[PDB]
Amino acid sequence: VDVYGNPIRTQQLREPQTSRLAGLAKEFAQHPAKGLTPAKLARILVEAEQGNLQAQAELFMDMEERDAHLFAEMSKRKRAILGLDWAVEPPRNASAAEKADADYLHELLLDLEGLEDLLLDALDGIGHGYSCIELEWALQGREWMPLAFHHRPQSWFQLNPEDQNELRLRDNSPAGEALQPFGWIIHRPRARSGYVARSGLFRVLAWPYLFRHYATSDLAEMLEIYGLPIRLGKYPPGTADEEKATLLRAVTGLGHAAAGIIPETMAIDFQQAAQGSSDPFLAMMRQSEDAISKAVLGGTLTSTTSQSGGGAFALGQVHNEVRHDLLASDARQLAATLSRDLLWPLLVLNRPGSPDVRRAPRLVFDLREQADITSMAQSIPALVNVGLEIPSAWVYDKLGIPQPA
């Protein structure tokens, strides 16, 4: 069975759950970001709270695509995880059989192509609040294998009417369809405590995005109007339609044309077009960008930048507060999700027996922080000459150097 105890039947693993839903694969995103107003955004969020996640997912995708600063921040945050070395470790004080199981799982993950793509797809749940990856199960003889990992759009799911924390497929029915066991890797990182609909970071970031969009569009319009002044022509009674058209064309082309002549009975008045500055717009854009930076990566390095300054402890100063905390949180949550969803089916299908769930191996990301070799290498000799018996295992582990074999 799975970790949650639901019965597992190997018959349903031959075909993906969504195969019998050919309607989903033919859908196109509705792009709800175009022509978006604060009222529309509020309605979208409220409806999403009630189980209509399609519009929210499409809006989040558009928001990711249309904002360069937000996209850069999210990409940097995800690439931070994608570059971490990982390993599979056996449970606490594991036995020989458990160690062998962990070693086999580690070897299987090393030789499993598409792991990086799986991690990238799973990390989308950081912003979207939940990411679902469908599994393709195949048999190369007697051992089950994940053939491929398919990322399904968040717009394909909904909320259970009887449960606000349980996701279901959109199968044209009011209650949707329950997710098949062992058929998905659902990643639901928890930045804030609440239901799945409210758990996305883009829900926090939506309003600054709209503020920045409005400011940028208004600035573009004002830059378009800038330049020549608006000038209005006046004509006396008894001016025919042809003369009216001639005066109109003359006024229209007068800005580009340096000189022109009109009868003394006519008049042209040059009125202010748009006089001001870009200061308000740019102030709003900077405020929104700082808010986005703080919300995504913390207000110590991105928005209120940590500035330059090297040194042996500079790495620690830059990392440990804020950056290390965020990195560790994301890595730990991703590792927990993976150990729950991918490691367990492999252990319970590819190996004999029914090992207890509490003793399953856990995927661990390498969060080791580079320690100053020079300072500590200076420090040891004094301590050892004093008489302290420092274990070599601690040194080898903390320095990153492996133990002799």
Binding site: P161, S173, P174, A175
Partner: protein, 44 residues
């Protein structure tokens, strides 16, 4: 007498209710209303 045949598994439930606000408790305890100083010792 008083029958009704309804679906239950549909995306909509017949005769849907509306819990617009919770069962808020309204009380009249002491120096919060005039019923208890410029009146009898009444509480609602």
């Amino acid at each position: 007498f008083a029958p009704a045949a309804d679906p239950g598994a549909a995306w909509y439930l017949l005769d849907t209710s509306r819990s617009l606000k919770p069962l808020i408790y309204q009380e009249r305890m002491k120096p919060s209303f005039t019923s208890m100083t410029k009146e009898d010792d009444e509480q609602v």
